[PDB]
RNA sequence: GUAAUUCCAGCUCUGCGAGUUUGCUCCCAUAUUGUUGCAGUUAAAACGCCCGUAGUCUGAAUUGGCCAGCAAUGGUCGUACGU
């Protein structure tokens, strides 16, 4: 895009903390309401970016006029797939599974989860069934459909979010 | 044990039939040798108790979701970029 990457350059002046912080990537998903903006990190820089972080938030999301959920880069195959670079025995870190709930708990940061389940219908399909802390939001309430949507696109996985 | 529906005989009747009883060994009947598949409060059957080696046994976790299904499979989401 390289939306995001010029955005952030320019308010990145000035600041001791926002000084060496870089964006490898970003995808925009359908939302309904708005869009949302998903924006990927090297790994060892999350917690960097994490650390204060919610000074910024506001000012790039009310410029680009859309949400914006910041992820970790958290990549990891059993069986070799070819063009892919794979552990024999692997680690748990590294295994998919390790990946996707790391990945929660970036998409939504600030407010930490208490519950998580799966539902298992009668057809044999399932729904991710996400509930978020009832004491931070207050703000969860508000992106709600934003992070079902933004999560949908990652690991390709049917969630809903409540209190 | 002097009235024998079981003895000893006759008569009638029954079975199987060029076959038919009688010994011993052996399988089934028998979940009465138990892998399938027994039993152990009182019928036979839980060590007087604890440690404990050989032995048998050993919680969860690791590449999937979604759509077309009648399956084989084939697409999309994820790109994780070694030889």
């Given at each position: 895009?390289?939306?995001?990457?010029?955005?952030?350059?320019?308010?990145?002046?000035?600041?001791?903390?926002?000084?060496?912080?870089?964006?490898?990537?970003?995808?925009?998903?359908?939302?309904?309401?708005?869009?949302?903006?998903?924006?990927?990190?090297?790994?060892?820089?999350?917690?960097?970016?994490?650390?204060?972080?919610?000074?910024?938030?506001?000012?790039?999301?009310?410029?680009?006029?859309?949400?914006?959920?910041?992820?970790?880069?958290?990549?990891?195959?059993?069986?070799?797939?070819?063009?892919?670079?794979?552990?024999?025995?692997?680690?748990?870190?590294?295994?998919?599974?390790?990946?996707n709930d790391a990945i929660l708990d970036d998409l939504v940061f600030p407010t930490?989860?208490?519950?998580?389940?799966?539902?298992?219908?009668?057809?044999?399909?399932?729904?991710?069934?996400?509930?978020?802390?009832?004491?931070?939001?207050?703000?969860?309430?508000?992106?709600?459909?934003?992070?079902?949507?933004?999560?949908?696109?990652?690991?390709?996985?049917?969630?809903?979010?409540?209190?």
């Amino acid at each position: 895009s390289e939306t995001v990457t010029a955005a952030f350059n320019e308010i990145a002046a000035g600041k001791p903390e926002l000084k060496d912080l870089k964006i490898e990537s970003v995808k925009e998903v359908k939302s309904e309401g708005a869009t949302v903006l998903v924006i990927t990190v090297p790994y060892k820089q999350i917690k960097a970016f994490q650390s204060a972080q919610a000074t910024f938030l506001p000012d790039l999301e009310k410029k680009l006029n859309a949400q914006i959920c910041i992820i970790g880069k958290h990549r990891a195959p059993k069986t070799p797939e070819h063009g892919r670079r794979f552990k024999a025995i692997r680690n748990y870190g590294r295994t998919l599974r390790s990946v996707n709930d790391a990945i929660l708990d970036d998409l939504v940061f600030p407010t930490a989860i208490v519950g998580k389940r799966v539902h298992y219908d009668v057809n044999g399909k399932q729904v991710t069934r996400v509930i978020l802390d009832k004491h931070d939001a207050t703000r969860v309430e508000e992106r709600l459909s934003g992070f079902a949507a933004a999560y949908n696109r990652l690991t390709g996985i049917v969630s809903v979010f409540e209190v």
